[PDB]
Design an enzyme around this catalytic site. Sequence first.
Site, PDB file in Angstrom:
ATOM      1  N   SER B  39     -18.966 -77.400  -0.501  1.00 53.77           N
ATOM      2  CA  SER B  39     -18.915 -77.120  -1.946  1.00 53.77           C
ATOM      3  C   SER B  39     -19.324 -75.635  -2.038  1.00 53.77           C
ATOM      4  O   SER B  39     -18.885 -74.716  -2.757  1.00 53.77           O
ATOM      5  CB  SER B  39     -19.736 -78.133  -2.721  1.00 53.77           C
ATOM      6  OG  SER B  39     -19.021 -79.379  -2.832  1.00 53.77           O
ATOM      7  N   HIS B 159     -13.387 -83.671  -6.958  1.00 53.03           N
ATOM      8  CA  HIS B 159     -13.377 -84.968  -6.294  1.00 53.03           C
ATOM      9  C   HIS B 159     -12.782 -86.198  -6.965  1.00 53.03           C
ATOM     10  O   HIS B 159     -12.999 -87.290  -6.385  1.00 53.03           O
ATOM     11  CB  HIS B 159     -14.907 -85.399  -6.154  1.00 53.03           C
ATOM     12  CG  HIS B 159     -15.538 -84.355  -5.284  1.00 53.03           C
ATOM     13  ND1 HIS B 159     -16.759 -84.486  -4.673  1.00 53.03           N
ATOM     14  CD2 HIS B 159     -15.031 -83.162  -4.896  1.00 53.03           C
ATOM     15  CE1 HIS B 159     -16.992 -83.397  -3.941  1.00 53.03           C
ATOM     16  NE2 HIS B 159     -15.953 -82.598  -4.059  1.00 53.03           N
ATOM     17  N   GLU B 168     -21.387 -85.417  -9.577  1.00 51.07           N
ATOM     18  CA  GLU B 168     -22.035 -86.634  -9.023  1.00 51.07           C
ATOM     19  C   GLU B 168     -22.914 -87.274 -10.090  1.00 51.07           C
ATOM     20  O   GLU B 168     -23.656 -86.654 -10.868  1.00 51.07           O
ATOM     21  CB  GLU B 168     -22.930 -86.355  -7.817  1.00 51.07           C
ATOM     22  CG  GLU B 168     -22.456 -85.540  -6.638  1.00 51.07           C
ATOM     23  CD  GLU B 168     -23.340 -85.035  -5.541  1.00 51.07           C
ATOM     24  OE1 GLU B 168     -24.464 -85.603  -5.527  1.00 51.07           O
ATOM     25  OE2 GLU B 168     -23.104 -84.181  -4.663  1.00 51.07           O
ATOM     26  N   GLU B 211     -18.590 -89.630  -0.072  1.00 51.51           N
ATOM     27  CA  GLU B 211     -19.985 -90.032  -0.018  1.00 51.51           C
ATOM     28  C   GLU B 211     -20.281 -91.482  -0.266  1.00 51.51           C
ATOM     29  O   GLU B 211     -21.478 -91.834  -0.191  1.00 51.51           O
ATOM     30  CB  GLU B 211     -20.742 -89.228  -1.067  1.00 51.51           C
ATOM     31  CG  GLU B 211     -20.518 -87.751  -0.683  1.00 51.51           C
ATOM     32  CD  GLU B 211     -21.460 -86.884  -1.495  1.00 51.51           C
ATOM     33  OE1 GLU B 211     -22.087 -87.482  -2.417  1.00 51.51           O
ATOM     34  OE2 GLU B 211     -21.358 -85.737  -0.971  1.00 51.51           O
ATOM     35  N   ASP B 246     -25.339 -84.306 -10.821  1.00 51.66           N
ATOM     36  CA  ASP B 246     -25.163 -83.133 -10.014  1.00 51.66           C
ATOM     37  C   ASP B 246     -23.967 -82.588 -10.819  1.00 51.66           C
ATOM     38  O   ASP B 246     -22.947 -83.258 -10.691  1.00 51.66           O
ATOM     39  CB  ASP B 246     -24.675 -83.322  -8.620  1.00 51.66           C
ATOM     40  CG  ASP B 246     -24.431 -81.989  -7.943  1.00 51.66           C
ATOM     41  OD1 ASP B 246     -24.328 -81.033  -8.772  1.00 51.66           O
ATOM     42  OD2 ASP B 246     -24.382 -81.882  -6.715  1.00 51.66           O
ATOM     43  N   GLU B 295     -28.912 -81.780 -11.414  1.00 53.58           N
ATOM     44  CA  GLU B 295     -28.792 -80.795 -10.328  1.00 53.58           C
ATOM     45  C   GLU B 295     -27.804 -79.730 -10.744  1.00 53.58           C
ATOM     46  O   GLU B 295     -26.749 -80.069 -11.244  1.00 53.58           O
ATOM     47  CB  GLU B 295     -28.296 -81.356  -9.004  1.00 53.58           C
ATOM     48  CG  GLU B 295     -28.279 -80.506  -7.755  1.00 53.58           C
ATOM     49  CD  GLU B 295     -27.454 -80.990  -6.602  1.00 53.58           C
ATOM     50  OE1 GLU B 295     -27.699 -82.210  -6.450  1.00 53.58           O
ATOM     51  OE2 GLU B 295     -26.708 -80.262  -5.954  1.00 53.58           O
ATOM     52  N   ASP B 320     -29.277 -76.248  -6.058  1.00 48.74           N
ATOM     53  CA  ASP B 320     -28.468 -76.473  -4.843  1.00 48.74           C
ATOM     54  C   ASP B 320     -27.685 -75.191  -4.611  1.00 48.74           C
ATOM     55  O   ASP B 320     -28.093 -74.398  -3.768  1.00 48.74           O
ATOM     56  CB  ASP B 320     -27.656 -77.752  -5.026  1.00 48.74           C
ATOM     57  CG  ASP B 320     -26.573 -78.001  -3.997  1.00 48.74           C
ATOM     58  OD1 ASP B 320     -26.696 -77.385  -2.919  1.00 48.74           O
ATOM     59  OD2 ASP B 320     -25.638 -78.796  -4.181  1.00 48.74           O
ATOM     60  N   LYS B 345     -30.933 -78.611   2.621  1.00 49.72           N
ATOM     61  CA  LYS B 345     -29.807 -78.909   3.505  1.00 49.72           C
ATOM     62  C   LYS B 345     -30.169 -78.093   4.753  1.00 49.72           C
ATOM     63  O   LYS B 345     -30.017 -76.899   4.616  1.00 49.72           O
ATOM     64  CB  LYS B 345     -28.477 -78.398   3.025  1.00 49.72           C
ATOM     65  CG  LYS B 345     -28.076 -79.024   1.711  1.00 49.72           C
ATOM     66  CD  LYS B 345     -26.719 -78.617   1.231  1.00 49.72           C
ATOM     67  CE  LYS B 345     -26.509 -79.272  -0.135  1.00 49.72           C
ATOM     68  NZ  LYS B 345     -25.113 -79.061  -0.578  1.00 49.72           N
ATOM     69  N   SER B 372     -31.386 -83.531   1.496  1.00 47.57           N
ATOM     70  CA  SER B 372     -30.036 -83.966   1.326  1.00 47.57           C
ATOM     71  C   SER B 372     -29.069 -83.855   2.502  1.00 47.57           C
ATOM     72  O   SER B 372     -29.143 -83.174   3.519  1.00 47.57           O
ATOM     73  CB  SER B 372     -29.465 -83.246   0.098  1.00 47.57           C
ATOM     74  OG  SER B 372     -28.067 -82.988   0.379  1.00 47.57           O
ATOM     75  N   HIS B 373     -28.000 -84.659   2.381  1.00 46.88           N
ATOM     76  CA  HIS B 373     -26.848 -84.797   3.239  1.00 46.88           C
ATOM     77  C   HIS B 373     -25.821 -83.703   2.793  1.00 46.88           C
ATOM     78  O   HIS B 373     -26.007 -82.994   1.827  1.00 46.88           O
ATOM     79  CB  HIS B 373     -26.073 -86.117   3.118  1.00 46.88           C
ATOM     80  CG  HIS B 373     -25.449 -86.500   1.841  1.00 46.88           C
ATOM     81  ND1 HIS B 373     -25.622 -85.912   0.653  1.00 46.88           N
ATOM     82  CD2 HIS B 373     -24.720 -87.612   1.536  1.00 46.88           C
ATOM     83  CE1 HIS B 373     -24.943 -86.552  -0.333  1.00 46.88           C
ATOM     84  NE2 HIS B 373     -24.424 -87.654   0.182  1.00 46.88           N
ATOM     85  N   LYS B 396     -31.235 -87.578  -0.957  1.00 42.07           N
ATOM     86  CA  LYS B 396     -29.852 -87.885  -1.513  1.00 42.07           C
ATOM     87  C   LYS B 396     -29.086 -88.199  -0.276  1.00 42.07           C
ATOM     88  O   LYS B 396     -28.923 -87.166   0.401  1.00 42.07           O
ATOM     89  CB  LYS B 396     -29.416 -86.662  -2.235  1.00 42.07           C
ATOM     90  CG  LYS B 396     -27.987 -86.478  -2.736  1.00 42.07           C
ATOM     91  CD  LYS B 396     -27.910 -85.238  -3.586  1.00 42.07           C
ATOM     92  CE  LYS B 396     -26.469 -84.786  -3.804  1.00 42.07           C
ATOM     93  NZ  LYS B 396     -26.640 -83.395  -4.282  1.00 42.07           N
TER      94      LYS B 396
HETATM   95 MN   LIG Z   1     -20.589 -80.342   1.238  1.00 38.69          MN
HETATM   96 MN   LIG Z   2     -24.516 -79.891  -5.709  1.00 40.15          MN
END
Ligand SMILES: [Mn+2]
Ligand SMILES: [Mn+2]
EC number: 4.2.1.11
Lengths: 436, 436
Positions: B39, B159, B168, B211, B246, B295, B320, B345, B372-373, B396
Amino acid sequence: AVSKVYARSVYDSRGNPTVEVELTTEKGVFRSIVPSGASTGVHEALEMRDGDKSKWMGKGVLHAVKNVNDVIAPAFVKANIDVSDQKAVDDFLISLDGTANKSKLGANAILGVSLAASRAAAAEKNVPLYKHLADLSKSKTSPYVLPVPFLNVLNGGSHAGGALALQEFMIAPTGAKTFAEALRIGSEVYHNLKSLTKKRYGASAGNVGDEGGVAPNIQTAEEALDLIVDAIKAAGHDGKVKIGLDCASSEFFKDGKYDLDFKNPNSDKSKWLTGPQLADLYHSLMKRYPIVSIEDPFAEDDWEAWSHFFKTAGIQIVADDLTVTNPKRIATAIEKKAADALLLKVNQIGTLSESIKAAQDSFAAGWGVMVSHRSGETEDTFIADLVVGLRTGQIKTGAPARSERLAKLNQLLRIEEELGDNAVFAGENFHHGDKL
Amino acid sequence: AVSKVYARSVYDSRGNPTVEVELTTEKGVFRSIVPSGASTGVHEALEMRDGDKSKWMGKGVLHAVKNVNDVIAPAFVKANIDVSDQKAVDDFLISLDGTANKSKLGANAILGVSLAASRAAAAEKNVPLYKHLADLSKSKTSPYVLPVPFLNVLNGGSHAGGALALQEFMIAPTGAKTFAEALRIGSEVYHNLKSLTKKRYGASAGNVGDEGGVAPNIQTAEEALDLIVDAIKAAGHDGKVKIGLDCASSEFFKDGKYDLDFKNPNSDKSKWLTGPQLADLYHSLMKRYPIVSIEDPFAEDDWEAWSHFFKTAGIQIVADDLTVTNPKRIATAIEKKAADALLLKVNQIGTLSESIKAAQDSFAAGWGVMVSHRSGETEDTFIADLVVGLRTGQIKTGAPARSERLAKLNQLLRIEEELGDNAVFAGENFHHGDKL
Ligand SMILES: [Mn+2]
Ligand SMILES: [Mn+2]
Ligand SMILES: [Mn+2]
Ligand SMILES: [Mn+2]
């Protein structure tokens, strides 16, 4: 010396509970997570679920975890079983259950302890797992065979919403020269497939089913096989990648006929087809596309359509719901000459000796064995060592997406590199990879 | 004593290559697989990819695997670094690279060796991994904190294909009393969400994004938050499960305005909104739904909209793309009072000491840290031990589906049971789980 067999509840690729068993010995803790999910046939070991609707939608396996902790362990510890002797282990588990389909303690409680023990046996013999499983089944080990992976790329049954009635469309890079090359060829094909998928059907069509394939609102089989050859064509691999279909035909068999259009349910009836009319639609498709495996072409009890299509199919014919990895259904399947490859799902019989045992009788009859996953898998890579120890030459472990999938492709990457010169890739001898 | 650092190419949840490093010491082989997907923000360690378009679509990491094998290992073996000293390890890796964003050897080559070393350090100290990571960061260990999992249930940005612009939609069972209960509550909610999803949008809407959440053709935010409260209502858990969004707002920021309707591209312009108009749409949503974390409400460089919404947000505000886990962007973020939680991350900074280091400065400023992932994850559960060692209270790690996801939820299940009475669940103190 097993000193503790313990179990806990964990989750599966679908957010549904499953059983995880860890077994202790003088060399550590060995674990196994039981696969789950169904389409499922009637003559198979049975899975024990709670049924309580106010907890996990009635799919917990709290009980199954109690049978392990409370029933199997204290019993299994006291037996003093040599884990190296897998039959001793499994006969012990069968003995404790005493039903034919394991409904007493549950096929999930049993399997998890049965597989954890094979890991522990290998720890102890000091050989990688695929090497033990090779010892237990008596397979040539000169050299080992890495399998052609049948990758799920597109779904269409009860699993997609258009008119398409065949369930799985799979690609098989049999053309490749190494496992690593087949997997790469396989993901470039897939990745292209997704792009074409999102141009033609809309970004909605890019979402994936349980096994990692896409489920676009497709209407005809041809319509689907064409999207896959365009996807193989664009990836630059025409001629090296093959197809395989899983028609899951039990799904549309009604009144002795097959409805290629269920999903109606203003079921046009007259277009329904007999075994032989459907046998003519598969031969059609067989001549226009590079199809090399057809799984479950006819329904689970329609023996005469199976026997009559196989006399002239000339391709690999797989039985999944027709044999439910049941050695007694395999054998009829064999005397009737109804097919030539078996889908092996270890949790469908519930024990490792009984699994290894079915592949062996399938092999002695000239059959092939596609080792396979379930709808609900886990991060456990047990089946990678198993297609390598049985030396079958072919594995269905989902599309090159969702890590419950890739956890097994990745393990075949590591085994391949590990074996160096001692491994050949099945390639085009996928069918009898065992006889190579 | 490290005797061999070696690397191989493996696949990620998306069928795209990623780097796997195994490090040997007198106690075994320890491994790590580097997450991937973006992203992504502009000021972060950089990932090295082949760029060859006729191999893996130009995303191989063959090079990155060469830097490990060919550059880092022979160098790392000769240094004789004590893996227990993580800074020594990471300073060594940074030193060898010498760029600020790791473009010399690649943040994927570096990270994999940096994480494999922490596992090896723990093997060697003989404590479970979360215990070491607790040693390295200096967190209370009396008791440990299990985190509230923010589960992705529904997706809507670049997405999903409807008009929805927020990315999200997450649920957080903060109401639960144990981790095991939160995860169960969480999957019953999800599973209901899917059912309602398939009745209302069609079976096509049941497919999942990367996800694990669903991506139905939804049009409004409200339209999406309503589907999630009906899903929480039907699962029987009203009041115990919360929401988190998010918005990935950088995605629709254009000309100093935010287009809540991109995806056109007959972009109506006049409905575009300023920081403050959008600040009024979030307060709306905040009063009608049980939203407790937002977020990236505003874009990566729109500092004044951040500072002005946070003065009255009263909820957790996560950065983020505004901080890219960069300690230098964190600090401005902190002097401007732009938010109060950081998404960490580890592959965005590229080393374990630099990661642990960012959470620590976020903590000292009164902030929270949602570990987070990434979009492309693997079967590696490294981040489960990490939200447990940092004691952050919240993680997350995707929806309760796709095992690259569940591989980490499952690991939190095992850690929780392991710690017995020594673990408290963050619950409603998710925000400052570190201060508990
Ligand atoms: Mn990503
Ligand atoms: Mn984000
Ligand atoms: Mn299934
Ligand atoms: Mn089938």
